Design a binder for this molecule. Structure first.
Ligand SMILES: CC(C)(COP(=O)(O)OP(=O)(O)OC[C@H]1O[C@@H](n2cnc3c(N)ncnc32)[C@H](O)[C@@H]1OP(=O)(O)O)[C@@H](O)C(=O)NCCC(=O)NCCS
Ligand SMILES: CC(C)(COP(=O)(O)OP(=O)(O)OC[C@H]1O[C@@H](n2cnc3c(N)ncnc32)[C@H](O)[C@@H]1OP(=O)(O)O)[C@@H](O)C(=O)NCCC(=O)NCCS
Ligand SMILES: CC(C)(COP(=O)(O)OP(=O)(O)OC[C@H]1O[C@@H](n2cnc3c(N)ncnc32)[C@H](O)[C@@H]1OP(=O)(O)O)[C@@H](O)C(=O)NCCC(=O)NCCS
Ligand SMILES: *C(=O)CCCC[C@@H]1SC[C@@H]2NC(=O)N[C@@H]21
Ligand SMILES: *C(=O)CCCC[C@@H]1SC[C@@H]2NC(=O)N[C@@H]21
Lengths: 506, 292, 506, 166
């Protein structure tokens, strides 16, 4: 029947042609266009097109718009099944009522049952007040399902417009949050309430814009120039991730060779012990084809974390960055690396670690800020993991830090070291000042003792003599060795006792 | 003779040949209404037995949540016309302070999940009960419901009551001398009031008391000399003058921050020089209101 | 042979008479006195009294003191087996040599094998420099074992003196940290390095003393006046906790009556909506005998958490506190409650929640601190748990907050409400301002609409009419209902999917 | 507060004095009397006393009666926990609507989680026509829970009046 076709075409228009032109004028796409762009061509299957709202208070009963402000369904990306929902800003400002909520909960439940990823695109405007208490009910169910699925399927969230109010909690519990550079923001309470209560006057962009949440607060995993770039990068990322916690990481055919040598690395570390070097070059030299998907690029830059490929399999990389704060560990970097390792471990992805760490960052600010627990988080995440771990100690490891960064003692499988590695309890000066304290008056004798201690102990050979280092390798072979080691470690099988769940510090 | 208990919110209020009768002003859950007079209740019953029954009924009377004046009445009735327990009363207090511990211990030795039946373990009959500065070497012994609390030199006193922890009034007989004592919980030990006196009794075994002495006598410093404002709020009312004095813990000022009232409290027994604030002025953190 | 008695009497003397006198003079007890005071009379069985260190460099070979600076063993507390170790300040400052770590690892491994609690008592002086890299190895092993036991057996820690350097990372991974007020401190870096790096001059107490760590940093769960108080309170606490994650909570015969009413509660809530009240009074009026063991009493007082007893079983209590900051949820309170709930769930202890919350804390400082994730932590905690949950909504629940705090929708089993409850999407004034915006000019009309909205919608009855509230109860019966409810709830058994572990937002 | 006790007294009365007298004239007990007689004295705890239907069709919005025709809760029999629900013939003839169904599904779900028996007492009159397809939805959910509980907890049914239709 053609009357059905007409009704369908009417549902496809949302809140009206005027509001759609206004949406375009701001430089943003419409919900259906975003869906069309993300999924493989011709694959979109839609659910629940005609659902309507059921409220009858405050004169809201006289405007029933089909769709109720969200488009939901499933399709395929590069041949693999995905489920997704997308809020429609043109319909009641994308607000969340009961009937609206039911679609979301349906699609979440189905995605959990069939064990496939979920992609959520947010463009909302908060709670629809006219619905009263019922609104809250809706929120509640959605939250529950998120928590039920955590650690079973990967969930991605993309904020492409305003996202005020309680609804902000729905993306917070997912695995990744991506933001658009100049049109999105997130906050629990808006500028009006801020002004009334505290007398501070701030704009929405200054309160929760992309910059604040990618550089200070740790919420966002990345930013992008506009909608198109964001969606294409999300598509790209999705190919790295395993579908669920049972199957393995995807495999493609690699164009690289496992037997290539890279002579350049012989000169990477400078002779001068103070001048720094760029770790990102080494990482991008060890992955398959110099392709690296960086996570949280702009926040706490003393640490580097991301996904690469080795021999056609995805591998996670964590590494210390000498170019910022001398590569020291602090609370922020600790949390960043800890959460990332937890994800990798949860979905059975192997981990490679590059270590260069002189200690922890001193100062009262860190102590009052809770550095003890924040630092314990990372040790926890490493020591509990049950996937292959490979570590490379490029320049120097010192003190307790050497143990948090995937030490042999905390369960790393293989530990290699370059010849320049300096593994010691602490620096030469401090150690000698502490040991030979009864003769600290002199300056020449102290220099003698310092030289002898430095030459005897600040090397990789004392640590090797105790058997803590599996092999001292030449730098230019590193890639080949890694590629071999991971290959053998696929079969790792260990068993812990029975617990409901751990009690990780928070 | 008749007792006129006076107030000089109510959390608990559990009033009691002698026949007594109380006339209740306010019931439990009331407030201190600034409108009317200060008055709480009346309690009425040979001269000697009369005064004795008045004493014991006074002790029985329990009030919590405010600072009542019953201690003053009990003390000024104790006179022949706060201290520390003495010869007649200190022993009577130590007995109860040991019997409470013994009861709690007998109930706490029934925990489930032990490894070997606890009957084989044998209690220790020696104990050192320590009041706020005193010391007494008690030897407790279970012979029936009543216990036999033997002292050092030889004085014994069989405690016998039916008080269950939670009930804020212990009431029973010690050496055939009927007694009503008020107990309050503490950190390790109990807080007792029997006569005008008050005490904080702890009870230890021999070795632990030999150990506790090593601990130093921790000291208490002072605060500053300004009443700093710890809440970024909007002042609502200053309810004191300039030249008055305030005892520890009394309300001084009251502000509104999140549309909920917040009351300030002084900290030193000192008179107040000059207000550093005013009605309706806004304050952020660390803003002077008073100068002690 | 008398020779063994002589050797024993010499080993029980630690590092000399004079150092013991210096220890007693600072006000601290010695290791063996603490051990003797914690455990039941005559139950202490000691391990490895004669171990010695094995280093030969820097002249260390000339002073071999038996015991290597730690005392370890097992005994009984109230008849139940416990293991414990206590570091010994008088022997090389309690530092951590190889053999020291060997003892610690032996005792931890055995305790995990027999499924029993562990108590650690710390009084140490950091890393032994002379043992070079060797010392580090020791550290590593201990850490691993801690993580293996986390969530299987309860672990308690008591800091009773200096704890500096890498050592501080061991207690951080335990479930409770207790501190002694004026003679303990914890930090990663000491004052000298702080001076050499940041030019700030700070003493040890101001940098890491008990007040700082119990009021600002979130690390510690409580302070005590001296050693004896701390140890006696630890003994008291141990009677609440289950022995492992299999057997239920311990139960004792109660002296209270399970059917008593308490009329006073009918007046607790004030009639003026802006006057506060003390929730703590209510909590102490609902437990068996007015006994309540508070956790993190001095930190983030807008929320109360602790252990009490109902009908002879331990129950955990979480409650909003109106007296401070109007009871709003902020980051600190959220973290405190989240970690406590996770502990309670891990060992199958039921939870009671008293709710009086108007919303979240507004301002730029909270947003720049990352309030989103911190508030998501508590929701995650509540929503994943599989133990009985009972909630009581005494006076307020506005907005999204009403969901995080154990709402029916996130998995609470029974939800009661006192008659004074007000469940709504937002306050009356804000809601009316938003709905009837086209008339924000008038004054009398706005007041009229406000009166109408307030009388119709700010009450518990709309929530009941939608079925979100199971029963509206008279206040004075609250205790009785709880005691009955929990009974039926003892059998709650439910199945979930299979995951390695959850992915909580760290 | 007295208003709450009064609203309770109004919810206990169901469909009116006259219908109750007519019920007794047929020789049948009302729902609350059955519940009281089955369970041990003083043990009955009721859920969801004040629920109301949420329909707006065919003028139904002008007759809103709290309870929607079913009493649900839990109690003890010889000390052992039991859950139960009982349909009420006086309120809209004991018919079945969405809000009605929500109570039944809540009590079935809870009974399955706690692993305790279920007693169902039937005095109904079938699907409430005015509610349209929504009513069918109600039916469906109830069936599902029955099937999940079979062979896990024993389920007993007592037919004490007309029980026609679906
Ligand atoms: O929001 P904004 O930045 O102020 O921009 P707008 O004024 O256009 O608001 C979005 C529209 O959805 C409506 N809207 C926005 N948020 C809403 C909410 N939480 N509930 C109901 N309606 C809402 C607004 O009334 C507005 O109406 P409009 O289409 O005529 O423009
Ligand atoms: C706080 C701290 C200094 C304890 O020492 P203290 O309170 O000041 O008291 P003391 O100076 O008398 O030290 C106690 C003794 O144990 C020794 N000692 C303390 N910590 C030690 C350690 N980590 N390794 C080896 N010996 C140690 C000291 O040499 C000292 O020698 P002594 O027995 O003859 O008296 C220690 O815990 C600490 O934090 N040290 C870090 C500071 C540093 O950089 N070097 C100090 C190590 S010498
Ligand atoms: C319609 C039919 C199912 C009712 O059979 P019945 O035995 O004759 O029912 P009754 O004569 O006792 O009266 C039915 C009453 O319950 C109501 N009722 C009963 N079953 C109903 C149903 N399936 N749908 C709607 N209303 C119903 C009617 O409104 C009617 O109103 P009333 O209480 O004022 O009398 C045949
Ligand atoms: C020379 O100037 C020494 C300064 C301290 C070295 C750095 S500070 C940060 C790390 N922490 C530590 O203990 N040493 C490292
Ligand atoms: C009246 O003045 C209301 C202002 C603030 C409202 C209250 S206090 C701030 C809390 N946050 C929020 O969303 N509302 C709560």
């Amino acid at each position: 029947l053609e009357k059905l076709e007409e009704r369908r075409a009417q549902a496809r228009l949302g809140g009206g042609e005027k509001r759609l032109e206004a949406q375009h004028k701001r430089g943003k796409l419409t919900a259906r266009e975003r869906i069309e762009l993300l999924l493989d061509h011709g694959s979109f299957e839609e659910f629940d097109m005609f659902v309507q709202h059921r409220s009858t208070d405050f004169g809201m009963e006289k405007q029933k718009i089909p769709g109720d402000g969200v488009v939901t369904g499933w399709g395929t990306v590069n041949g693999r099944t995905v489920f997704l929902f997308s809020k429609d800003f043109t319909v009641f400002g994308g607000s969340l009522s009961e009937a609206h909520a039911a679609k979301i909960v349906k699609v979440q439940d189905m995605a959990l049952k069939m064990r496939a990823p979920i992609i959520g695109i947010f463009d909302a405007g908060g709670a629809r007040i006219q619905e009263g208490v019922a609104a809250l009910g809706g929120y509640g169910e959605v939250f529950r399902r998120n928590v039920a699925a955590s650690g079973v399927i990967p969930q991605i969230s993309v904020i492409m417009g305003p996202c005020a109010g309680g609804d902000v909690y729905s993306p917070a519990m997912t695995d990744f949050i991506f933001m658009v550079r100049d049109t999105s923001y997130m906050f629990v309470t808006g500028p009006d309430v801020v002004k009334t209560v505290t007398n501070e006057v701030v704009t929405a962009e200054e309160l929760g814009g992309a910059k604040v949440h990618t550089s200070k607060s740790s919420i966002a995993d990345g930013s992008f120039e506009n909608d198109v770039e964001a969606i294409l990068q999300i598509r790209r990322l999705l190919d790295f991730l395993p579908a669920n916690n049972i199957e393995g990481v995807p495999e493609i055919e690699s164009f690289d060779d496992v037997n290539r040598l890279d002579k350049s690395l012989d000169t990477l570390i400078p002779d001068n012990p103070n001048k720094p070097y760029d770790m990102g070059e080494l990482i991008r030299r060890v992955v398959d084809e110099g392709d690296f998907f960086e996570i949280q690029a702009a926040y706490a830059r003393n640490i580097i974390t991301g996904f690469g490929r080795v021999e056609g399999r995805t591998v996670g990389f964590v590494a210390n960055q000498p170019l910022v704060l001398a590569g020291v560990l602090d609370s922020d970097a600790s949390r960043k690396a800890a959460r990332f390792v937890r994800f990798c471990n949860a979905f059975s992805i192997p981990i490679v670690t590059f270590v260069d760490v002189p200690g922890f960052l001193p100062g009262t600010a860190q102590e009052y800020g809770g550095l003890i627990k924040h630092g314990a988080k990372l040790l926890f995440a490493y020591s509990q993991a049950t996937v292959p771990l490979v570590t490379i100690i490029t320049r120097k490891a010192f003190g307790g830090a050497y143990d948090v960064m995937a030490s042999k003692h905390v369960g790393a499988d293989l530990n290699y070291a370059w010849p320049t590695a300096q593994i010691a309890v602490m620096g030469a000066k401090g150690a000698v000042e502490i040991i030979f304290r009864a003769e600290i008056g002199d300056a020449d004798k102290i220099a003698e003792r310092t030289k002898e201690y430095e030459d005897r102990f600040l090397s990789p050979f004392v640590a090797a003599e105790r058997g803590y280092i599996d092999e001292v390798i030449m730098p230019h072979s590193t890639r080949k060795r890694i590629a071999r080691a991971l290959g053998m470690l696929r079969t790792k099988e260990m068993e812990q006792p029975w617990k409901k769940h751990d009690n990780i510090p928070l | 003779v008749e007792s006129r208990v006076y107030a000089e919110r109510l959390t608990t209020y559990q009033p009691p040949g002698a026949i007594v009768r109380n006339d209740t002003g306010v019931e439990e859950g009331g407030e201190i209404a600034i409108h009317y007079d200060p008055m709480i209740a009346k309690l009425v019953t040979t001269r000697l037995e009369a005064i004795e029954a008045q004493a014991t009924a006074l002790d029985a009377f329990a009030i919590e949540g405010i600072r009542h004046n019953i201690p003053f009445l009990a003390t000024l009735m104790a006179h022949p016309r706060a201290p520390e327990p003495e010869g007649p009363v200190a022993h009577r207090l130590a007995a109860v302070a040991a019997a409470i511990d013994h009861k709690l211990n007998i109930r706490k030795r029934g925990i489930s999940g032990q490894m070997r039946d606890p009957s084989l373990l044998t209690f220790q009959r020696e104990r050192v009960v320590v009041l706020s500065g005193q010391r007494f070497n008690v030897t407790v012994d279970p012979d029936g419901d009543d216990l036999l609390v033997t002292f050092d030199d030889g004085t014994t006193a069989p405690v016998r009551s039916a008080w269950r922890p939670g009930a804020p009034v212990w009431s029973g007989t010690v050496g055939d001398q009927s007694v009503a004592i008020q107990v309050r919980p503490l950190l390790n030990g109990v807080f007792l009031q029997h006569a005008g006196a008050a005490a904080e009794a702890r009870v230890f075994t021999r070795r632990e008391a030999e150990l506790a002495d090593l601990m130093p006598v921790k000291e208490n410093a002072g605060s500053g000399k300004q009443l700093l404002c710890p809440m970024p709020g909007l002042v609502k009312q200053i309810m004191v003058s300039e030249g008055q004095e305030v005892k520890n813990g009394e309300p001084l000022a009251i502000v509104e921050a999140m549309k909920m009232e917040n009351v300030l409290r002084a900290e030193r027994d000192g008179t107040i020089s000059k207000i550093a604030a005013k009605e309706g002025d806004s304050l952020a953190v660390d803003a002077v209101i008073l100068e002690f």
